[PDB]
């Protein structure tokens, strides 16, 4: 089997992408944030505290295929400080025509204010390794893990758009969705993430610096977070750019034409266009814009978030020894 689903930016800034997910029988369609940086499929629900719901909810008592996973609970906290917790059902989940039965669907009893405040996200669908799932006492498998037995190939691909719709595919590689060839690189699962080591970077039309950058491919992080020295080298090429303590990162004039940023994948190179690094004005009508490449020093891990991933066709190869592929597009 295969599946293919359209993913859409939630807002004009590409803060996140939502993908429809059908849960239950009959299907309840929720728009979830597909997150290669976590491993829980959780949803706003009829169980969620009413004052914390503003979203479409999953009602397990309306699904004939929902089963309570007795004694199971979950609680998750994300790098941006958001969190949620609740109980666990197994149910039928379909994405883009690919159906998994017995998928754990984590029903929120409570959600943090950032989730309440975001009307467009009805929950998350984690796609990191199942060792990061937060269900206790027994962790639950991700949608991808449960799908692998049936898939035509144990792969999924992310093709995120710059201010445009894109695609998540499960089970096949669309050879028309990218240019050139895919270069694959090794993945470490020691921390549960799609963790890999970039071979280096270049700023604009300058030289490629061979420097190992260990980081994670995370569709659920907005920006590209890289080592401080790398980020400084980038913004040194932008004459109005400065770090702003009060805004919380590099800011620059919206009218600047920004240089590209290139990262290495083995011998191959992925070029992020300068426009992708303009994340947008700090407020509507401001002359100042927030940068899409920021230092990872404060969060302690390098993250190839959406600013980077949307410049590539990305293959998440979930064979027993996983690998990560990138192609230009």
UniProtKB/Swiss-Prot annotation:
Q: What is its EC number?
A: 3.4.23.22
Its Gene Ontology biological processes? proteolysis
Q: Which family does it belong to?
A: Belongs to the peptidase A1 family.
Q: Which organism is it from?
A: Cryphonectria parasitica
User: Which keywords has UniProt assigned to this entry?
Assistant: Aspartyl protease, Disulfide bond, Hydrolase, Protease, Signal, Zymogen
Peptidase A1 domain: which residues?
17-327
Where are the disulfide bridges? 254-289
Q: What is the protein named?
A: Endothiapepsin
Q: Which residues cross the membrane?
A: none
Instruction: Enumerate the catalysed reactions.
Output: Hydrolysis of proteins with specificity similar to that of pepsin A, prefers hydrophobic residues at P1 and P1', but does not cleave 14-Ala-|-Leu-15 in the B chain of insulin or Z-Glu-Tyr. Clots milk
GO molecular function terms listed in the Swiss-Prot or TrEMBL record:
aspartic-type endopeptidase activity
Q: Name the domain of life.
A: Eukaryota
């Amino acid at each position: 089997s295969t599946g293919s689903a359209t993913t859409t930016p939630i807002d004009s800034l590409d803060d996140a992408y939502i993908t429809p997910v059908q849960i239950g029988t009959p299907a309840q369609t929720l728009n979830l944030d597909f997150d290669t940086g976590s491993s829980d499929l959780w949803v706003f629900s009829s169980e969620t505290t009413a004052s914390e719901v503003x979203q479409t909810i999953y009602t397990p008592s309306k699904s004939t295929t929902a089963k309570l996973l007795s004694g199971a609970t979950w609680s998750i906290s994300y790098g941006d400080g958001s969190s949620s917790s609740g109980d666990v059902y197994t149910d039928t989940v379909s994405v883009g025509g690919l159906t998994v039965t017995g998928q754990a669907v984590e029903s929120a009893k409570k959600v943090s204010s950032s989730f309440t405040e975001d009307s467009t996200i009805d929950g998350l669908l984690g796609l990191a390794f199942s060792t990061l799932n937060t269900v206790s006492p027994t962790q639950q498998k991700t949608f991808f893990d449960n799908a692998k037995a049936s898939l035509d190939s144990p792969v999924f691909t992310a093709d995120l758009g710059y201010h445009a719709p894109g695609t998540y595919n499960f089970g096949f590689i669309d050879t028309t969705a990218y240019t050139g060839s895919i270069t694959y690189t090794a993945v470490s699962t020691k921390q549960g993430f799609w963790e890999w080591t970039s071979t280096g970077y270049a700023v604009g039309s300058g030289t490629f610096k061979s420097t190992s950058i260990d980081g994670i491919a995370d569709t659920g992080t907005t920006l590209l977070y890289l080592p401080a020295t790398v980020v400084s080298a980038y913004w040194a090429q932008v004459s109005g750019a400065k770090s702003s303590s009060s805004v919380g990162g590099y800011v620059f004039p919206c009218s600047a034409t920004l240089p590209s940023f290139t990262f290495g994948v083995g011998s191959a190179r992925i070029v992020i266009p300068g426009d992708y690094i303009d994340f947008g004005p700090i407020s509507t009508g401001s002359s100042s814009c927030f940068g899409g490449i920021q230092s990872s020093a404060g969060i302690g891990i390098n993250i190839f978030g959406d600013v980077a991933l949307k410049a590539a066709f990305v293959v998440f190869n979930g064979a027993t020894t996983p690998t990560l592929g990138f192609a230009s597009k």
